[PDB]
Amino acid sequence: GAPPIMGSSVYITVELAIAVLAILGNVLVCWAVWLNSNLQNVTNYFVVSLAAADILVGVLAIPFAITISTGFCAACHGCLFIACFVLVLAQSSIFSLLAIAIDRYIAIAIPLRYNGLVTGTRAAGIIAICWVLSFAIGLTPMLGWNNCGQPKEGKAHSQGCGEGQVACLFEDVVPMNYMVYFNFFACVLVPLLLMLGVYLRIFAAARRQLADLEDNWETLNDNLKVIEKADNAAQVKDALTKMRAAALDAQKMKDFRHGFDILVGQIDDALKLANEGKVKEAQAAAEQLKTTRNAYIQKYLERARSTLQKEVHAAKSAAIIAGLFALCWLPLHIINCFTFFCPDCSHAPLWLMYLAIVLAHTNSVVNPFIYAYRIREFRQTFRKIIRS
Numbered sequence: 001g002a003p004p005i006m007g008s009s010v011y012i013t014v015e016l017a018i019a020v021l022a023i024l025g026n027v028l029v030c031w032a033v034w035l036n037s038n039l040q041n042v043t044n045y046f047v048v049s050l051a052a053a054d055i056l057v058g059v060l061a062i063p064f065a066i067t068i069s070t071g072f073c074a075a076c077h078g079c080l081f082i083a084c085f086v087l088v089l090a091q092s093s094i095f096s097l098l099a100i101a102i103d104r105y106i107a108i109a110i111p112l113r114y115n116g117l118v119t120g121t122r123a124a125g126i127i128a129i130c131w132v133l134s135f136a137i138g139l140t141p142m143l144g145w146n147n148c149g150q151p152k153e154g155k156a157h158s159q160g161c162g163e164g165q166v167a168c169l170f171e172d173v174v175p176m177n178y179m180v181y182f183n184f185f186a187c188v189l190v191p192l193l194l195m196l197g198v199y200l201r202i203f204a205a206a207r208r209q210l211a212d213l214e215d216n217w218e219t220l221n222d223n224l225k226v227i228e229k230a231d232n233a234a235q236v237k238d239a240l241t242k243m244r245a246a247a248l249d250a251q252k253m254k255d256f257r258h259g260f261d262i263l264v265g266q267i268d269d270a271l272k273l274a275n276e277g278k279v280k281e282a283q284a285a286a287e288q289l290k291t292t293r294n295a296y297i298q299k300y301l302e303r304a305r306s307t308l309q310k311e312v313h314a315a316k317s318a319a320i321i322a323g324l325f326a327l328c329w330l331p332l333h334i335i336n337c338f339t340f341f342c343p344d345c346s347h348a349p350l351w352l353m354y355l356a357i358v359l360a361h362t363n364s365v366v367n368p369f370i371y372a373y374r375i376r377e378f379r380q381t382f383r384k385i386i387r388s
């Protein structure tokens with residue numbers, strides 16, 4: 001049995017290295033949002049709240065985790081706070097991640113009413129409520145769902161603990177049925193699955209909207225061919241009626257409106273000639289639509305396609321952050337499931353427990369890198385902060 005301080009020295013050194021990187025990276029995130037007005041939006045307010053929780057992981061949760069790894073003597077309820085505060089920060093991160101996904105769904109599914117529905121004041125109230133709810137969820141053991149009524153007295157005496165004290169160890173004071181049923185299943189797994197469903201809806205909405213743009217573009221070009229090779233006025237009228245409904249459907253900003261004003265008006269001009277039985281004159285009037293399509297309509301199609309592809313890319317970046325949260329925290333949750341559900345299984349070894357703990361803490365480091373690599377506005381703001 002090698003001296004415990006040796007293995008503890010590696011674990012403590014790694015934890016402190018994680019804490020430093022978690023503080024610097026996420027302070028840089030908050031500093032960037034504070035300085036750049038282009039980064040000041042509802043989505044990034046939840047990013048800041050997420051960054052604040054990761055800052056608290058380095059300032060508080062990691063020192064708390066180092067403290068509880070020693071098994072020091074402590075009053076059991078004070079031990080619970082040290083043990084459970086990281087659950088407040090993890091829960092707050094989950095609420096921020098869910099809000100970011102929901103915010104991205106509103107912007108892509110109903111962009112016309114997004115700005116009136118999603119405001120900065122309403123976001124601040126949501127952030128405040130989610131932090132209060134995270135304290136209630138994470139500190140639920142302090143409300144009575146704990147093992148403080150059944151302390152390990154033999155372990156407390158062997159450590160020389162005083163009266164009313166226990167050896168402060170995570171699995172000794174925090175019930176595993178809380179950790180699995182309440183914290184993992186209800187408060188972590190279910191919101192994460194809701195996040196996945198929201199992201200599936202986002203990408204499905206983006207894919208559908210892109211296909212609709214290409215469908216209206218095809219409908220515009222197909223019916224033009226129908227008009228050119230029509231032999232009676234009724235055929236020209238049929239295609240023009242479908243184009244007019246498609247043109248108004250694509251219309252659902254001044255150069256935008258003018259280009260569609262010309263398009264619909266030119267369709268109405270040809271429709272009037274078609275109803276008069278003037279086939280040759282209607283087809284020639286419909287040929288003018290090609291000038292409007294090249295000069296105006298195609299530019300709107302490409303810009304609309306460009307805006308949607310940026311929303312997909314922004315939603316992928318946010319989904320990567322949620323996926324990395326799941327990847328970093330799931331091993332610790334899964335180990336707790338083995339400890340709880342399989343008492344006949346040998347406990348996961350010590351080195352694996354602290355590997356899972358370190359990995360969960362590493363998640364507080366990774367988000368600043370995802371923003372820097374995937375969001376130009378952050379990366380450029382990061383550069384200006386560092387240079388100056």
Ligand SMILES: Nc1nc(NCCN2CCN(c3ccc(F)cc3F)CC2)nc2nc(-c3ccco3)nn12
Pocket residue numbers: 086087090169170171179332333336347348349350351353354357
């Ligand atoms: N489960 C857990 N533990 C800790 N810290 C204590 C580590 N010791 C756990 C006991 N063990 C052990 C016991 C008997 C053995 F035969 C072998 C062992 F190796 C030593 C090591 N911290 C945590 N945090 C979260 C957590 C936070 C969010 C989700 O889960 N679970 N968790």
Ligand SMILES: CC(C)CCC[C@@H](C)[C@H]1CC[C@H]2[C@@H]3CC=C4C[C@@H](O)CC[C@]4(C)[C@H]3CC[C@]12C
Pocket residue numbers: 073074075077078079081082
């Ligand atoms: C706002 C920030 C800076 C304040 C940080 C306060 C932290 C460090 C304080 C608040 C409550 C404190 C705990 C309260 C009770 C106990 C029980 C005692 O037997 C050992 C210490 C222990 C476990 C304390 C450790 C430190 C502690 C967690």
Ligand SMILES: CC(C)CCC[C@@H](C)[C@H]1CC[C@H]2[C@@H]3CC=C4C[C@@H](O)CC[C@]4(C)[C@H]3CC[C@]12C
Pocket residue numbers: 326327330331332334335338345346347348349352
């Ligand atoms: C989310 C992704 C990374 C999957 C994570 C898989 C990890 C967490 C899984 C894969 C294999 C698992 C181990 C397989 C077998 C045992 C032996 C048992 O006596 C205690 C648990 C223990 C030690 C498991 C702990 C959790 C474990 C390490």
Ligand SMILES: CC(C)CCC[C@@H](C)[C@H]1CC[C@H]2[C@@H]3CC=C4C[C@@H](O)CC[C@]4(C)[C@H]3CC[C@]12C
Pocket residue numbers: 330334337338339341342
């Ligand atoms: C987010 C994704 C990974 C879904 C989460 C799946 C979790 C809940 C699953 C994956 C593997 C599962 C474990 C696999 C094997 C065992 C051993 C058995 O003796 C008791 C149940 C137990 C311990 C399972 C509990 C639940 C478990 C941890």
Ligand SMILES: CCCCCCCC/C=C/CCCCCCCC(=O)OC[C@@H](O)CO
Pocket residue numbers: 045046048049052056060120121123124127131
């Ligand atoms: C032991 C005690 C430790 C203290 C833990 C306290 C945890 C609470 C921390 C909360 C940080 C939240 C920061 C989140 C800040 C988000 C920015 C914002 O909301 O502004 C948007 C509006 O201004 C626009 O109108």
Ligand SMILES: CCCCCCCC/C=C/CCCCCCCC(=O)OC[C@@H](O)CO
Pocket residue numbers: 077124127128131132135136139140142143
């Ligand atoms: C935009 C800014 C956001 C501001 C965030 C607001 C700060 C949230 C603070 C919440 C405190 C509520 C705590 C309520 C949660 C219950 C747990 C508890 O209080 O246990 C402590 C005692 O049992 C000890 O004996």
Ligand SMILES: CCCCCCCC/C=C\CCCCCCCC(=O)O
Pocket residue numbers: 058059060063066067070072073
């Ligand atoms: C920027 C502020 C961040 C706070 C830095 C604090 C760093 C201290 C790190 C670890 C504290 C470990 C506490 C040791 C527990 C005592 C061990 C024992 O009593 O047996």
Ligand SMILES: CCCCCCCC/C=C\CCCCCCCC(=O)O
Pocket residue numbers: 129133136137
């Ligand atoms: C851990 C148990 C969770 C607690 C369940 C219920 C606690 C709070 C419930 C809902 C808070 C709703 C927020 C509404 C605040 C008012 C909004 C407004 O002023 O417009």
Ligand code: NA
Pocket residue numbers: 050053054089090093363364
């Ligand atoms: Na986090």
